[PDB]
Amino acid sequence: ISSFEVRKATIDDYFELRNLICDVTRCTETLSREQAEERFRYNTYHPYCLVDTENGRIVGYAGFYIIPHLGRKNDSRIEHVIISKEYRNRGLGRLLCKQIIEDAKNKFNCGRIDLTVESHIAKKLYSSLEFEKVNTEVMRNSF
Template structure:
C-alpha cells in the first residue's frame, strides 16, 4: 500500500466529517472556532488558517485516511495541527506516516527546521508518537490540558 500526501478534495471533507461524531471530538480536533454539527462542504472554510496548508493522506485507492494542516508558528517555526486519522486506520501506523510526510512537507514549504504542535495530555497514543518523532515538551508553553511540543 502506497500512501501519498495530497491536497484534499471536497469528497475528502465529507469523509473527514464522518470521523467527527460529537462536540467534544470536534473541539479536540479542530478547536473552539469550528462549530458542531457542521456541514462537510463548509469544512474547507471552517478549517482555513491564514497562510496555512491542508493535506490528506490517501491510500492506494485514493481514499483519504488521514488529514492534517500546517501554518506559520512562533519565532520562525512551522506548526502542525488538526491531525486526524480514519477510525478504521488507527493503530496501524497511519498516524506516523501522516506526521512524517506532513512534517517533511511543512519543512520543505516553509524552510523552517523547527516544527511545533499541541497535543492533549490525555492522548497518550499521540504523545507517544510525537515523542518518537523527536518532539519534546515545553512546559512553559503548555496548559493543564494541552502539551506544547517542539522539534529542534
C-alpha cells in the same frame, strides 16, 4: 500490499474530511461552500489527508498551520491529526506526520513545529519524531 498516498486536502474533500474529523472530534458546525472556501483559502492552513489508493477513500487527516514570525523563520503547528479507527497502529499516523514534518522544514522553511499532545498514543508518536517537551503553560479562553 495496501497502497496509500499523502496529499493536500481540498474543498472537494470537505464532507469526507468532516466525517473523519467529526467521528473522533468535538464538532459543532457544518460549513457552507462559501465558508468552506474561506477556510481553505487561508494561506497559512495546509490540510493534509491520507488516501487509500485501492479505494479512493480518505483515511487520515492532519492540519498544518504556518505561524508567521518577524525576525526569524516562521513557526508552525500541527493540530487534529486523525487516522481512521480501522487503520490505526499500522504506521500511517507516522507516515502522514513525516510528510508534514519534512514539508515544514524544507518546503515552508519553518524554524520549528509546535503542538499540544494530551493523548497517550500521540505523545509516543511525536517523541519518536524528535518532538521534545516544551516547558511552557498553556492557557485558554473559551467563548
